[PDB]
Amino acid sequence: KELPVVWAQEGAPVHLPCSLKSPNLDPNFLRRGGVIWQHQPDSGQPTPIPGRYTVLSVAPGGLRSGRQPLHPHVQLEERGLQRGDFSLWLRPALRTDAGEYHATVRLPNRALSCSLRLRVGQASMIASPSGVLKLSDWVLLNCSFSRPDRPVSVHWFQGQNRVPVYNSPRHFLAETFLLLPQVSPLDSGTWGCVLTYRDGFNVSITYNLKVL
Amino acid sequence: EDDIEADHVGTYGISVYQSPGDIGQYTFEFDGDELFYVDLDKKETVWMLPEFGQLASFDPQGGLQNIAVVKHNLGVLTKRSNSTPATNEAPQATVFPKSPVLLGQPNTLICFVDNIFPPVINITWLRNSKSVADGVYETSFFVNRDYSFHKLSYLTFIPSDDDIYDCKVEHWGLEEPVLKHWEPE
Amino acid sequence: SERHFVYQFMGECYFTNGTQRIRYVTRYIYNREEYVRYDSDVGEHRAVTELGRPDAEYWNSQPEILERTRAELDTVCRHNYEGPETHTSLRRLEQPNVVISLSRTEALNHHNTLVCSVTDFYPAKIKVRWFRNGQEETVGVSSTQLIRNGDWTFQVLVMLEMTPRRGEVYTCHVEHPSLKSPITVEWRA
Amino acid sequence: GPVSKMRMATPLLMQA
Numbered sequence: 001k002e003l004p005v006v007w008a009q010e011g012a013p014v015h016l017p018c019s020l021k022s023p024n025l026d027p028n029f030l031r032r033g034g035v036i037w038q039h040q041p042d043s044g045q046p047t048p049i050p051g052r053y054t055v056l057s058v059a060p061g062g063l064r065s066g067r068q069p070l071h072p073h074v075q076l077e078e079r080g081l082q083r084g085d086f087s088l089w090l091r092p093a094l095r096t097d098a099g100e101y102h103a104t105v106r107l108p109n110r111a112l113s114c115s116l117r118l119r120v121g122q123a124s125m126i127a128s129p130s131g132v133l134k135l136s137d138w139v140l141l142n143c144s145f146s147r148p149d150r151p152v153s154v155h156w157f158q159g160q161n162r163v164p165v166y167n168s169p170r171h172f173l174a175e176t177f178l179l180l181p182q183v184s185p186l187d188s189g190t191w192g193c194v195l196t197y198r199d200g201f202n203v204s205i206t207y208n209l210k211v212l
Numbered sequence: 213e214d215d216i217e218a219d220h221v222g223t224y225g226i227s228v229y230q231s232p233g234d235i236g237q238y239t240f241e242f243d244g245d246e247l248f249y250v251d252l253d254k255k256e257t258v259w260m261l262p263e264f265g266q267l268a269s270f271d272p273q274g275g276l277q278n279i280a281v282v283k284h285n286l287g288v289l290t291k292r293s294n295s296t297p298a299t300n301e302a303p304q305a306t307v308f309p310k311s312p313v314l315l316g317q318p319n320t321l322i323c324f325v326d327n328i329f330p331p332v333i334n335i336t337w338l339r340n341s342k343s344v345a346d347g348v349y350e351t352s353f354f355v356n357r358d359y360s361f362h363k364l365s366y367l368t369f370i371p372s373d374d375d376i377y378d379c380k381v382e383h384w385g386l387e388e389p390v391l392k393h394w395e396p397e
Numbered sequence: 398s399e400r401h402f403v404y405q406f407m408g409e410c411y412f413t414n415g416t417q418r419i420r421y422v423t424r425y426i427y428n429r430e431e432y433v434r435y436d437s438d439v440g441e442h443r444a445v446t447e448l449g450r451p452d453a454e455y456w457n458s459q460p461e462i463l464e465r466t467r468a469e470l471d472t473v474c475r476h477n478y479e480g481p482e483t484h485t486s487l488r489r490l491e492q493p494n495v496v497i498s499l500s501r502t503e504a505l506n507h508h509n510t511l512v513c514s515v516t517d518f519y520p521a522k523i524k525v526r527w528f529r530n531g532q533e534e535t536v537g538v539s540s541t542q543l544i545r546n547g548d549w550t551f552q553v554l555v556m557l558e559m560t561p562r563r564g565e566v567y568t569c570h571v572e573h574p575s576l577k578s579p580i581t582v583e584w585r586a
Numbered sequence: 587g588p589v590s591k592m593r594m595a596t597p598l599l600m601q602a
């Protein structure tokens with residue numbers, strides 16, 4: 001009960017793993033294992049009238065079987081399947097994937113069936129002075145996404161080489177904000193931010209700051 | 213956006229040449245199914261379906277002429293490109309039966325290997341981890357739009373409870389030869 | 398080991414209609430990279446990459462080669478379409494084999510997933526539908542992609558989550574043009 | 587009389 005919840009940043013591949021604990025097993029007994037994964041896009045709000053469906057299933061032979069329109073995002077790594085791991089791997093984070101996911105892993109001896117929830121959190125960095133900055137004026141950047149829990153650590157960096165920016169007399173940091181009072185022309189370039197969490201959710205979102 | 217749709221599409225001959233080693237190949241495919249191919253050294257046209265050869269005939273000398281001109285094309289290109297690199301990709305296999313599996317009735321197990329690049333691959337079969345080679349068919353290398361290739365192998369076998377079959381793939385772009393196991397029911 | 402290289406040449410005939418509109422495209426590939434391309438809509442060999450600039454120019458300075466390639470639209474594409482291809486592809490007939498399977502059974506009153514295997518058919522426009530007691534179901538339906546067997550035949554597997562009581566009978570319904578009336582396979586619980 | 591008509595594929599050649 002109390003199904004766990006996992007967040008996902010839109011446009012970024014999300015890790016959805018589920019392995020059988022960690023005992024080293026015989027690979028011959030590992031190749032003989034089927035997998036079924038179902039999804040029910042739902043929410044607390046009345047998104048349904050108040051439905052589940054099978055997205056993909058692979059028998060030990062290696063054949064795919066899912067919804068009539070093929071899902072190009074989901075592509076099992078196959079390597080991890082031969083390494084005692086069953087993980088969902090989508091390349092683009094689907095904003096329509098917000099819902100509940102259930103599993104079914106069938107082996108000749110034992111069997112596990114993991115289950116959890118997925119919530120799509122669109123990550124973006126919003127600027128208080130929307131536009132191109134003047135030769136010298138203030139600026140504020142807030143990078144975040146739709147998540148109730150507050151980040152534990154926030155990192156900033158400047159330039160295409162991603163040089164981590166620290167708190168300076170001209171670089172003010174407070175919670176998840178960055179401010180520069182005087183924006184010299186040297187401050188132009190790609191400024192990015194990296195977020196953290198208790199579950200270890202990284203969000204590396206960039207923004208091209210242009211100064212006069 | 214890159215794909216254009218037509219009622220029917222035919223390659224009417226695909227030429228593949230690999231250097232060094234002088235690996236030549238010339239096929240004839242229409243709408244997915246291989247109509248036939250042309251043998252390299254035997255100088256003969258081999259049809260995938262025997263009934264297809266009862267109504268049409270292709271001259272294999274034109275097959276040898278085109279594989280020779282493709283050899284010349286690759287030769288002058290490798291001489292002009294000087295130092296240019298070539299990449300390798302690891303293929304992906306999938307084992308499935310041809311007809312619905314009925315225990316005790318002879319069936320054909322198919323091993324489909326996609327994303328083959330370069331097209332140099334050893335596709336073998338193992339019966340209960342033992343080497344087996346009883347009626348092992350191998351089609352020619354079909355071509356994908358990714359410029360990779362996909363081949364299919366056939367094994368006529370008898371499904372039994374005491375037999376487990378696996379398809380072994382050995383490729384240049386594979387650090388180890390991978391084996392896909394399979395056991396019905 | 399040392400330097401390996403792969404070359405490829407092909408020429409595709411696109412038939413949007415029967416004999417009305419034909420399209421011809423020749424492609425040259427070096428190391429999974431196309432460098433020379435000819436199109437019937439263009440009328441001459443164009444260099445898709447700069448590497449194929451001189452080669453295509455050699456095919457643009459020869460009038461007999463260009464006229465031969467332009468005539469290949471009728472001598473290679475249309476001639477093969479109206480002759481051999483019409484007599485070897487349209488004449489090849491097929492019949493789908495439709496069977497029914499079940500992963501798990503037990504009392505069957507619990508949750509279950511019924512399987513319909515349509516094998517050994519030439520690929521065409523097929524409409525496969527699940528019917529419970531005569532009514533079509535769409536929820537819980539999961540069908541595999543078009544599986545190319547490579548031997549001119551195809552194969553597909555459809556699945557329906559069948560929960561209702563044993564007293565009801567299920568049926569698989571497929572609509573393939575090679576068969577006049579859609580064959581219907583029934584399974585009792 | 588019925589014949590096995592089948593037009594061949596025609597490649598091309600560059601100089602380089």
Ligand SMILES: *[C@@H]1O[C@H](CO)[C@@H](O)[C@H](O)[C@H]1NC(C)=O
Binds near residue numbers: 142143144145176
């Ligand atoms: C600023 O970001 C925080 C977390 O980084 C977020 O909770 C908040 O909604 C954002 N916007 C504000 C405070 O206007």
Ligand SMILES: *[C@@H]1O[C@H](CO)[C@@H](O)[C@H](O)[C@H]1NC(C)=O
Binds near residue numbers: 200201202203
């Ligand atoms: C965030 O950090 C963890 C711990 O190093 C790492 O495994 C993970 O890949 C990072 N997340 C993303 C989305 O890159």
Ligand SMILES: *[C@@H]1O[C@H](CO)[C@@H](O)[C@H](O)[C@H]1NC(C)=O
Binds near residue numbers: 333334384
């Ligand atoms: C394939 O088998 C041949 C012998 O039949 C061997 O020489 C070759 O190294 C094998 N593997 C590859 C990747 O060529």
Ligand SMILES: *[C@@H]1O[C@H](CO)[C@@H](O)[C@H](O)[C@H]1NC(C)=O
Binds near residue numbers: 414415416417
């Ligand atoms: C295809 O060709 C036939 C025969 O000439 C013609 O009747 C038909 O209109 C054509 N199709 C289209 C879409 O124009």
